[PDB]
Ligand binder design. Structure first.
Ligand SMILES: [Mg+2]
Ligand SMILES: [Mg+2]
Ligand SMILES: [Mg+2]
Lengths: 49, 97, 94, 157, 48, 231, 227
DNA sequence: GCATCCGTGAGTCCAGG
């Protein structure tokens, strides 16, 4: 039930060499394995939450 | 921090309080300037933080960084369940699971 | 914890006896519409509605309250069962 | 544990003094640390206990409120007719217990003051509170210790 | 359905750290940096 | 020994950024003032946001328009970031139209302009259109407070209209500095600086004033006490 | 989207000149601490009060000296002095010296202080010292008007050469503690209910103390007004 | 007196598929 779609990553007329990225699939950021987010994190207790 | 010194801002008072704290924590070398000491802390991956509710700094320096966090498939939207009465079994006439 | 639960355990000789006392009393009050309460108007448990305060409907709340007031006699073989049932139906109709 | 710990510093390191005013002056010179152990006369006390004396716990906390000292600083306080040497942190702990169970006397009797509050001591506190005041009050004390423990962990840093 | 992140959803990192979202504080309650930047998630050191 | 009113410096850099210095204030009070102002400035500061989108030949959010590189989901992600300034205070709601086509990277300038309405980031990319690719939007942009998710405000100007998440607050950052200062023989006085950043919909100074006003109005509430009927 | 809030209700619960509870519900999300922390700061730092700033006692050299004829030491009398609640009745007044001479077997109270014009001792059954046969106590205590808390070694004020400086407990407030709870208004789920708690000494009351606090802030809001 | 062969048992709840 996860959504599996692909998105175009190049624009009209772009000269692309062999193996260049034409579309990003699910959980893919410009060809890298995008299994989540990079968030800004603080490691400290917090009121019990 | 050189961004800050150029923008025209001195070492905030709360950074002082936390710096004295972290000094009693053997985290900075005593006597160095606030910039020297904040750089010392930062290099340990710690920074000053201000409790958003109060304005006051955390009694001490706190590790802060960029992290890879993922959403796992197990979402609560899919698991919250509750029945008053429902369907029963054929032989046992107990509820289905 | 329940309001005044250490005294309540002090009242009975076995915690489960208090439990049975409370459940029986609360059913007695559910049956007669609380017209048999030993509580005074000022001691009624209240529930804060959106409109205003009203009587608490939870008859077990009422039961444990009445139990702390001392105005109830609990024990074994106090009276014949249908005699109690009909005397309560006589005093407080349904 | 963080609030009811006390600081142990290295600058003073057991110097000898004749009058307390000599010790306060020495700490003024940056020669001795506030909570470092020294020996004024034949007595082995610390600069913080002399420099800082509080008539009642409210005052101690009003000072910690104004930056004067910190909860882990060893200081002198007058609490229940007693002139105690202890931190304001341990004074706060005892106030939390005492307001939690609504009996200052029993409360004082229950705590161990001159120790950091850990798993074992907090445990014995709950056993003892149970036995002495009952489960309703021990539940109120538990919500209490819960509240502050979380609050003081957060900012503890 | 476009699923936003809610209280009870499970987050994790690549090092074993996993846990459920328990609280979503508004931006004015978050620990923030001297320059005003609020942090995104507050993990508890007690795991490590 | 009682202090007196301080001097109020104001350094604005366009509609975006502003520093607001106050000195001198009594010890501690740098925070006693600077933090509640922060909190009221990150939330409760009114602003605007896109609340609805209707596109032609789009039935729902998970579509793709032929001739367009972006999926509708992405287009609403772009359109969220649109900053739309209302020059008139009576104005509540605006329906911006956009008709575009051909080989062209539609930006936020391409909106048919309205009076009492100004797009504060016209260079904002929206779509990448291809030969023959068209686009006909009607976006609805409202005033409001704070963060109102799509799943709540449910705004649809018509049947195929998509409700959109609205981040109304126009304050993009609030930091405040407490520096050391003296006046005469007084030491440890506080010098309060408030750095404020917005989007241009409202400027840092207007923001700070409405936050002041909110806090003062809020102090108004304590003025009429009431007895406690617990007894 | 469209919001229709209502202005909250302010609720008061005072037990004498000493204690007050204050519940202000409902408040939009986050405003409980937005109001709580300031008023707390203000209520512990800037409520005008009176404090025993200095003390001279006859033939008493320093603070950690003994007093022959009295059982308390000097530190102890200085503490008992920290607990004196004196209230200036004339807004002009700024400072007083208070003198107290007693001797022989007796337990000095705050009553024994010699009355002054526009000076009310709120806690006259307060204990200072018990003297014995031959115990002589001549002392002068300096009492000023300020705000907050000043350690004895931060003002250092001396009338004379043997006056002891005393940590100055200006604040008529002994503690502020506020606690916000989530509360609901029909469909509104995340609203705030502000409970404030204020212990004073009796010179000012809790309600008076809080009203003074809200005033200072309201006035500080006006400092964002003319560059 | 010993091996020897037999049968019988081997944690809870939850999701899917
Ligand atoms: Mg002292
Ligand atoms: Mg004890
Ligand atoms: Mg809330």
């Amino acid at each position: 039930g996860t959504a599996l779609d692909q998105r175009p990553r190049v624009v009209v007329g772009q000269r692309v060499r062999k193996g260049d990225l034409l579309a990003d699939g699910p959980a893919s950021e410009n060809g890298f394995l995008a299994l989540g987010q990079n968030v800004l994190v603080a490691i400290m207790p917090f009121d019990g939450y | 921090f050189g961004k800050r010194k150029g923008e025209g801002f001195g070492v905030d008072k709360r950074e002082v309080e936390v710096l004295r704290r972290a000094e009693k924590l053997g985290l900075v070398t005593p006597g160095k300037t606030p910039e020297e000491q904040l750089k010392e802390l930062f290099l340990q991956g710690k920074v000053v933080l201000y409790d958003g509710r109060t304005g006051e700094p955390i009694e001490g320096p706190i590790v802060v960084g960029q992290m890879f966090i993922m959403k796992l498939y197990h979402m609560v939207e899919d698991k919250m369940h509750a029945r008053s009465t429902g369907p029963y079994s054929l032989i046992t006439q107990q509820p289905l699971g | 914890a329940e309001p005044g639960i250490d005294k309540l355990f002090g009242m009975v000789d076995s915690k489960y006896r208090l439990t049975v006392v409370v459940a029986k009393r609360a059913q007695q009050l559910l049956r007669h519409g609380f017209k048999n309460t030993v509580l005074e108007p000022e001691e009624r448990p209240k529930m804060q509605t959106l409109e205003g305060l009203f009587d608490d409907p939870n008859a077990v709340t009422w039961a444990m309250k009445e139990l702390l007031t001392g105005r109830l006699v609990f024990g074994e073989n106090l009276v014949p069962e249908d005699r109690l049932q009909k005397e309560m139906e006589r005093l407080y109709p349904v | 544990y963080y609030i009811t710990q006390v600081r142990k510093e290295k600058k003073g390191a057991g110097l000898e003094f004749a009058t307390p005013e000599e010790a306060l002056a020495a700490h003024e010179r940056g020669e001795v640390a506030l909570n470092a152990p020294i020996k004024v006369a034949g007595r082995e006390t610390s600069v913080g206990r002399l420099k800082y004396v509080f008539a009642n716990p409210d005052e101690a906390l009003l000072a910690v409120a104004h930056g004067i000292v910190d909860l882990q600083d060893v200081v002198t306080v007058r609490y229940m007719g007693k002139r105690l040497e202890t931190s304001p942190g341990r004074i706060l702990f005892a106030r939390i217990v005492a307001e939690a169970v609504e009996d200052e006397k029993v409360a004082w009797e229950l705590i161990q003051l001159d120790v950091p509050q850990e798993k074992n001591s907090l445990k014995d506190l709950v056993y003892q509170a149970f036995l002495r005041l009952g489960m309703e009050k021990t539940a109120r004390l538990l919500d209490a210790l819960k509240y502050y423990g979380f609050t003081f962990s957060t900012t503890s840093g | 359905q476009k699923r936003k992140l809610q209280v009870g959803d499970k987050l994790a990192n690549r090092h074993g750290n996993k846990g459920v979202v328990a609280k979503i504080l508004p931006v004015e309650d978050m620990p923030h940096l001297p320059d005003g930047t609020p942090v995104d998630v507050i993990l508890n050191p007690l795991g490590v | 020994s009682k202090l007196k009113a301080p001097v109020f410096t104001v350094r604005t850099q366009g509609r975006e950024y502003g520093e607001f210095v106050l000195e001198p204030l009594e010890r501690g009070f740098g925070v006693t003032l600077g933090n509640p102002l922060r909190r009221i400035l990150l939330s409760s500061i009114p602003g605007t946001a896109v609340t609805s989108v209707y596109i032609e030949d789009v039935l729902h959010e998970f579509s793709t328009i032929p001739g367009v590189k972006e999926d509708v989901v992405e287009i609403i992600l772009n359109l969220k970031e649109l900053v739309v300034r209302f020059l008139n205070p009576s104005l509540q709601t605006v329906t911006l139209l956009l008709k575009a086509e051909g080989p062209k990277e539609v930006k936020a300038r391409d909106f048919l302009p309205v009076a009492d309405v100004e797009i504060m980031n016209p260079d904002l990319h929206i779509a990448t259109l291809e030969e023959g690719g068209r686009l006909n939007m009607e976006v609805r942009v409202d005033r409001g407070v704070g963060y109102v998710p799509a799943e709540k405000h449910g705004i649809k100007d018509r049947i195929n209209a998509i409700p959109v998440d609205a981040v109304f607050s126009p304050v993009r950052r609030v930091a405040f500095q407490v520096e050391d200062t003296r006046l005469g023989q007084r030491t440890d006085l506080d010098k309060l600086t408030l750095r404020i950043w917005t989007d241009g919909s409202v400027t840092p100074l207007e923001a700070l004033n409405q936050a002041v006003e909110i806090l003062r109005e809020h102090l108004t509430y304590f003025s009429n006490p009431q007895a406690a009927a617990v007894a």
